[PDB]
């Protein structure tokens, strides 16, 4: 381009070529799980009387 644009492109480039900063990203995924089943049940079977 014209020397006028060369000097304009030279500032654009210098701004645009800036050392892009780096990012360290730690994620922390914590899960905790449990639970309590209970099955208690009583059956009475009698020949004479009846069964449950």
């Amino acid at each position: 381009a014209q020397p006028d644009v060369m000097a304009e492109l030279e500032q654009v480039v210098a701004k645009l070529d800036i050392r892009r900063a780096q990012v360290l990203v730690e994620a922390i995924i914590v899960e905790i799980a449990d639970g309590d089943g209970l099955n208690l049940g009583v059956q009475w079977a009698n020949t004479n009387g009846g069964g449950t």
Partner: protein, 53 residues
């Protein structure tokens, strides 16, 4: 005989007569698979009674 009840006296009686002299248990064991409650039989002389709950 009714149906709302877990099992029918039919399958029970037949199974008990089929379980005699070391018979099978498949038939009867399949009836009693999902049953849940108090099946109480009573014999006063000749009238048989089956209560389901």
């Amino acid at each position: 005989q009714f149906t709302n009840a877990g099992p029918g006296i039919g399958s029970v009686a037949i199974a008990a007569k089929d379980y005699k002299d070391n018979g099978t248990t498949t038939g009867l064991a399949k009836l009693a698979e999902n049953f849940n409650g108090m099946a109480a039989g009573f014999y006063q002389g000749n009238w048989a009674m089956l209560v389901t709950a």
